[PDB]
Amino acid sequence: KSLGRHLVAEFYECDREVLDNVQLIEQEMKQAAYESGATIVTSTFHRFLPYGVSGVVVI
């Protein structure tokens, strides 16, 4: 149907200790990639200051 499927999601009321954990988020994000059955090319996560996490996983 299309070259790809794209989910744009807003997550509200999340565990704030989870949201502000750069290492955990990467972990989780990496695992999420695994569940979808995709192959990870690279991943780069960054801990914004003060509170905040930003990361991407290329598949």
Binding site: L3, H6, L7
Partner: protein, 56 residues
């Protein structure tokens, strides 16, 4: 492809993008894991078709 995430701890909010390719890759399997992982209590998801065949 990519899976991205940008979190705002102060608001308990996270903007997530799950863009995959190939029939063997289900983006909703990524969503489900993340929902569990974040303890998200309310979500809103819009599914986009990237590069429709009838468009390219």
């Amino acid at each position: 492809x990519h899976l991205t995430i940008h979190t705002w701890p102060e608001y308990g909010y996270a903007a997530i993008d799950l863009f995959t390719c190939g029939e063997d890759v289900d983006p909703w399997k990524a969503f489900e894991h993340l929902k569990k992982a974040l303890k998200a209590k309310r979500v809103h998801v819009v599914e986009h078709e990237r590069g429709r065949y009838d468009e390219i």
